[PDB]
Design a protein around this ligand. Structure first.
Ligand SMILES: Nc1ncnc2c1ncn2[C@@H]1O[C@H](C[C@@H](N)CC[C@H](N)C(=O)O)[C@@H](O)[C@H]1O
Ligand SMILES: Cc1cc(C)c(S(=O)(=O)O)c(C)c1
Length: 226
């Protein structure tokens, strides 16, 4: 019942079952990551002018992908802004949980918001790709040997000139624990760039962070270049 127990039990299935351990933890209720809401830094950036420039540039077909959406809080936020948003998670339970949590959302009924059980590493990239991708508590969930494929998949999922927002969390330092892995902007930079493929347009410390997130989180905005 203790959070530390739930993390220890979670890290035990990931060692025994691997990627299939995520749907196991979702249906078993062991979801110590679920905060019920989007992180404040995401809203403040979008409502800022540095973020406004992206929301006003938004075309009438701007597509947003939220890998590892969980219950799809961030995905529902981007749909509320007018984006054709897709929430993708490996767990079919989580996708079913997101569809209940946002059942009354006008965007789920209209189709702007969509929740699908997809594999970030396996699903077919749409031809038009994605104008924006948001990664929170997904890169830090992947084991270290999957970060390079993560950045490789991000290079093809984001269209040229598109945006990849990465809320780097948790920035805990030398903590060698499993999920959630301690990450920094450097680890995200190495995975994304294999000035090769991306441009770090913004790297900021969020003004309004969750209290447990203070000092362990940075919002980084990447642009896909040629
Ligand atoms: N290869 C994958 N493709 C898609 N989703 C994945 C993959 N591996 C793990 N996940 C999902 O990533 C999520 C990680 C969780 N910490 C959820 C974090 C989620 N972003 C939240 O804020 O609640 C789980 O829902 C997993 O099912
Ligand atoms: C994948 C994953 C797992 C856990 C347990 C947590 S945490 O909320 O407890 O820190 C986070 C943020 C991500």
């Amino acid at each position: 019942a203790t959070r530390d127990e739930k993390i220890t039990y979670l890290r035990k299935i990931i060692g025994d079952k691997g990627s299939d351990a995520w749907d196991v933890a979702w249906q078993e209720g062991v979801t110590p990551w679920d905060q019920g809401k989007i992180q404040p830094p995401l809203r403040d950036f979008i409502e800022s002018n540095d973020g406004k420039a992206l929301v006003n540039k938004k075309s009438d077909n701007a597509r947003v992908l939220v890998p590892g959406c969980g219950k799809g809080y961030d995905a529902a936020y981007f749909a509320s802004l007018g984006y054709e948003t897709l929430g993708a998670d490996l767990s079919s339970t989580a996708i079913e949980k997101a569809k209940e949590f946002w059942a009354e959302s006008p965007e789920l009924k209209s189709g702007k918001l969509s929740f699908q059980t997809l594999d970030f590493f396996k699903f077919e990239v749409p031809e038009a790709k994605y104008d924006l991708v948001y990664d929170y508590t997904f890169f830090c969930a992947l084991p270290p040997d999957l970060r390079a494929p993560w950045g490789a998949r991000m290079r093809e999922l984001v269209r040229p000139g598109g945006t990849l927002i990465t809320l780097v969390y948790p920035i805990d330092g030398a903590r060698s624990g499993g999920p959630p892995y301690s990450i920094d902007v450097q680890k995200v930079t190495d995975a994304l760039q294999g000035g090769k493929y991306w441009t770090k347009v913004l790297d900021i410390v969020p003004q309004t962070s969750s209290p447990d997130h203070v000092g362990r989180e940075r919002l980084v905005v990447w642009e896909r270049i040629n």
